[PDB]
Design a protein around this ligand. Structure first.
Ligand SMILES: Nc1ncnc2c1ncn2[C@@H]1O[C@H](COP(=O)(O)OP(=O)(O)OP(=O)(O)O)[C@@H](O)[C@H]1O
Ligand SMILES: Nc1ncnc2c1ncn2[C@@H]1O[C@H](COP(=O)(O)OP(=O)(O)OP(=O)(O)O)[C@@H](O)[C@H]1O
Ligand SMILES: [Mg+2]
Lengths: 406, 406, 406, 406
């Protein structure tokens, strides 16, 4: 019961732009899950996760692809920065935390997993107990087949009003106190929800989810490589590698949820490696990170697509926000293409993040509309190619200024 | 469970190519545990473990030999980076942790031993309780010799239905809560398995495990010797050697599961010793590491062998996974040759990382296939030397690339 | 339980060759506790103990004597490494630990002490309760002097059968259930075993083992002296001597097992003192180490004795372990002298590590036999001067190998 | 109600040898206590303690004089090392601890102080509750002037029997259980002593004792002075002075016993000042350490007196210890004089501690008797001048050896 290499890339194709290779890789990894759990007992142990190591610059999709991947398989996920554990110079943060955190993440996974499952039932019972105070039921009933006319037009009346209308004052009993529907409603929900939920029967779900589906994204694992010094003193970082193997090559670790294996968890490390090369990773890590994939630096089209396609692109969002003031914003193809060329420019000119650059540029170009929105009520402003250039040109052209306000 | 040296080396031979000297070393050790038992009280508690110190390059087998050695011995094992405690002014953990961890590992094993031993007894009584809800048994019974017709076609009915067919709804009491068979089953099993397991028995058992068969493996021991670039931080690395002394000389450490004595734990310290010499260790430690053995670098022939001969060889493992997709992979002998050859080349032209290299090369090689797979069910794909060159020659040629991908 | 100095030196002489003066010092320390134990209330607590300070090279027997003295004393022993507490840039655990550990160590002895002490009592009562089910005793009895004919030939019959024979099916009552002697026996043992064990006592019994018999061995008490190089770190070492004082002065520390008074713990400080001198210890501490004793470096003859005279000498150890495989090892006098000379020579040409060198040397010399043993069953192998030469001479000479193998 | 400068010195003259100056000084400070608490309210605030700073070598009486002084006024006391708080380079110990500790010290003062104070009261309330079970009192009573005939001959009967007689079986109620007077007595006493032990009525006793009579002995405050560096970097210590000011010039500090002032606690810091001079202390401290006193180095006579006079001199102690074996030791004037000259010699020759040196010398000189004591039963050994010189001469003469075994 699992998707496949290609079928996976499709799903990822519905959220990430470009980076097909990387996709194919997280695709395979995810598939080998369903491949192992499909073998004899003697192998299940022998075959270890095919960890992937992503190589690319920022703003190009790395981390998203992992989120999306873990999401795509509702798998416990966690993102850490290799350097977070480098503060060993004097401070102290230990790797165990990674898995430790992962489990938590899982317990929240499984938790929320039950809630949203029967949240309706709760709300139902919740509003099924608010009608009792509105129309004090006369003890004893039932007996015939009038289940349809049983709730009485009374309860049915307040029913419609409650879920769809006024009603915002009364007192409900718990353990009897005055309150208010809009809140007493959110008071019962949690209570009711309790009844449905279970306890120690969360272990073989969370610890299992983790140990069998968890995914870890180890960011900038390149910030913890060799470096110019010596393989002895500058170990303040190499030693951070020597601290991950246990996690990477199967070890254990106790958590406030029990014991977690880690023997076969999917690790996806990533770096730009524009200084150090994956080859500088200690041999144990090289060994355990078999799948190597390089991501490409984004292009204006990517940018153009990242501005539009996304169900919640900054574009749609902005339009949304200004509609709050009565203004009707509209980004036109040329406009978008233009914001796109604006980002690319700045990335190119100055330092180069990636899709990141879209935020300041867009918020910059809309400064005046953003400030004047209130007075632009009822108007229809359209951001075309003209607009954009006579707002962003001056700035983009000015590299120095770009390093500050863009 | 006590086999002879020559035999122990024969098992080891099944998962590790070459390194005979190392195999004999470890086998002698394992073997003495049986010899010591044949001894009288006095000697039995005078004869200590012949801790090993392995000397060799990376990816040649030092650790693999220790795992496999612990496995055929069925003993709680544990890897530890010597450096995990190093610091020129940092923090780190405490060495005793090594015994806490090893002990957890002993409990884990024991739990398993007992569960699978009487898993039936559990599942049995488990469903034996799911039938009671399905068919409320009328209090009081027995009396005659009708044991067959006693479970009444009623229970017998559900029983087949339950075990075989359909799993799916009701409410069973614990501490009365609606559930679902397919799940209430797993719930009851654990609940039932419990009653069977004797805590003190497994706690004591888990201990003897560690105390009488523990095998700890200290990697990168040479990363603790002298150095010379300082005085404090170096005699601080030495600090790690001092801290380990109690464990190797015999001491007691307190753990969740009780008090553990280290006097009979076998220690396998490993090291490349390219910079320092085993003579650079602190005397007390050199004293506690009687047996010394040097493992040798692997050769291309070795890689070919490593590729297919070991038991769950990566080759056989690849084939297994692919089969899951209905694909039949086969490796040409020359295919196997070109691969070992590619790896060697890279290890030679970049960073030599031993047998480890084989993984990365094998993954890259079979990626296009791995991604297709599903779309090749029923096909017999053969990896001949032509396939191995078309997919790796260029890569191997690009020394930069190899530093990134292979 | 208290013997004279002269007698302790006699016990000491069964395991440690030479170092008579030290055996004496230690002998006095011990007899001295018994003496203080003979005083009145007035002095019992107004008698400042006589901690030892051992001065000597490595591998000459300082630790050994303390251990073995702790054994004949049958006292919980612990061995601290003076430096563990220094840190010119670390945390360095706090000395409290020494009494902590010792206590954990005391507890163990006590536990396994009590058990193996009155085990017979349990197994006896255990089976004494299995005969009750075999031959249901008729209530009320006794009265005359028919004590040996009272158990009746019935109980006496099953008695012999039980401990020496069949009988493997029966149901016993605990808290009434069918079982099986083979296991119902063990089941009872632990149950009864409980009865005898006093948890409110042994905890105390532990403190009474510690506070009044506890021996501590502080090593490298010389790696704590002034030094000179700098000044900050020195007072950082001296910090350990300052902090060390209360223990040797006589105080109370708190453990997970209660409060413990360090007042009668015998302290054995020890050091090589190659760079530093006792006179360089902090005045407070010097005066608190009234008993001073030196140990002489060992000589080849000594090695030869260490090799054979001691009770369970490594020689008698190997010969024993080999006979376990049915091999008759005979060490010729010529063979011993060469082992001793080989060790001495390596200690001369590389790092001198005292008697420890004999271990590595002996092991190496014996590996081949040690591996082949099983197949050499029934044969005789004489380790004589010629035998020693073939196996060691090449290695001893090759100074680079000796820094790795011997 | 207080002694006087002279009268105090005498008390100190009863335990310390020489060092009259320092005595006269601690005397004065102690007296100013009784002088301030004797002035108008406006002054009591204005006048602060006249802190004393002792200047002298080790082994001459400093700390002893402070103990004796705090004892002489049963004042809370504490001795700290200035350097203890210098481990600030990387570790961490804070001065608050000092007062923090001081209070504890006080609560222990007041504690054993309270018990023996109202010990009678407890026992009374104890047996007063044991008669209730013996003669179950009839509820309701009193009313007339029959206080003498009220206890009834019944309670009065058991009263005498109890404290002076049999009665050793009964059950008392606590939290109702059978016991035995002989024990049921000691059980009630403590349990009763609890009610008395001023629960919260311990505050205005400890915090008061501390705040009004506390004495702090700050050892080696010279180890935290200027030093060759700069008044900015080497502040790792000068900053330690900047941390005592608060305490010395009155601040506060919270303790698990409440709040403590510190405004006027007597501080007695000391140092040898053979490197740094009191002039190097930061100005604030100099200001707050008004009384400056120099102690002199001990003399053989001092040594001679230190050996004999003390009610528990090492000499008496030894004679005692050996009597445990039947031997009758006797130090003769010439003998002691000789041990004195021997200590002085070594102090002079090598490094010079002080009285300290008496421990090893005496224990060295008695080595043989100490070892042979057992066989010397019934004999009368006399350590005269002869004995000593022909046991200690060769060693004292040998400076080098002196630095090790003396
Ligand atoms: N004969 C062999 N020699 C080397 N590696 C082998 C051999 N057979 C299989 N392998 C595999 O090669 C990898 C090498 O890892 P291993 O830890 O054994 O190397 P190592 O050099 O001993 O490591 P370390 O330097 O950390 O002690 C493992 O994944 C192991 O399973
Ligand atoms: N008479 C002896 N003299 C020296 N070593 C001996 C003797 N008998 C046995 N040995 C063995 O020699 C080794 C030396 O260890 P020991 O701890 O006694 O030396 P040490 O110099 O006191 O050590 P450290 O410097 O760690 O305090 C031990 O393995 C010990 O068992
Ligand atoms: Mg290694």
């Amino acid at each position: 019961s699992e998707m496949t290499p290609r079928e996976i890339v499709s799903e990822l194709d519905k959220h990430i732009i470009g980076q097909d290779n990387a996709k194919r890789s997280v695709a395979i990894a995810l598939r080998n899950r369903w491949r192992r759990m499909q073998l004899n007992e003697e192998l299940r142990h022998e075959v270890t996760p095919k960890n992937i190591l992503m190589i690319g610059p920022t703003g190009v999709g790395k981390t998203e692809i992992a989120r999306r991947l873990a999401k795509l398989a509702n798998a416990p996920f966690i993102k850490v920065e290799a350097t977070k554990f480098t503060e060993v110079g004097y401070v102290g943060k230990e790797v165990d935390s990674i898995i430790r955190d992962l489990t938590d993440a899982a317990v929240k996974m499984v938790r929320v997993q039950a809630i949203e499952k029967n949240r309706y039932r709760a709300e139902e019972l919740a509003e099924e107990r608010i009608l009792d105070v509105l129309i004090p039921p006369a003890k004893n009933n039932w007996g015939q087949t009038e289940q349809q006319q049983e709730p009485s037009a009374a309860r049915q009346a307040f029913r419609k009003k409650l879920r769809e209308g006024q009603l915002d004052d009364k007192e409900i009993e718990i353990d009897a106190r005055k309150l208010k529907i809009k809140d007493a409603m959110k008071l019962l929900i949690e209570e009711e929800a309790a009844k449905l939920v279970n306890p120690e029967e969360l272990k073989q779900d969370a610890i299992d989810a983790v140990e069998q589906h968890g995914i870890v994204f180890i960011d900038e694992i390149d910030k913890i490589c060799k470096r110019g010094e010596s393989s002895g003193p500058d170990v303040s970082r190499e030693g951070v590698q020597r601290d991950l193997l246990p996690l990477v090559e199967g070890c254990t670790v106790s958590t406030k949820h029990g014991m977690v294996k880690t023997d076969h968890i999917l690790f996806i490390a990533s770096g730009a490696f524009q200084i150090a090369k994956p080859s500088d990773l200690i041999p144990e890590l090289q060994g355990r990170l078999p799948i190597r994939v390089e991501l490409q630096a984004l292009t204006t089209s990517d940018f153009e697509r990242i501005l539009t396609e996304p169900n919640a692109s900054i574009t749609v969002q902005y339009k949304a926000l200004m509609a709050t003031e009565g203004v009707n914003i509209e980004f036109t193809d040329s406009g978008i293409k233009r914001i796109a060329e604006a980002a690319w420019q700045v990335n190119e000119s100055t330092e180069n993040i990636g899709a990141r650059r879209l935020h300041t540029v867009l918020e910059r170009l809309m400064e005046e509309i953003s400030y004047d929105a209130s007075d632009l009520s009822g108007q229809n402003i359209t951001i075309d190619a003209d607009y954009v250039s006579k707002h962003l040109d001056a700035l983009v052209a000015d590299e120095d200024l770009s390093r500050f306000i863009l």
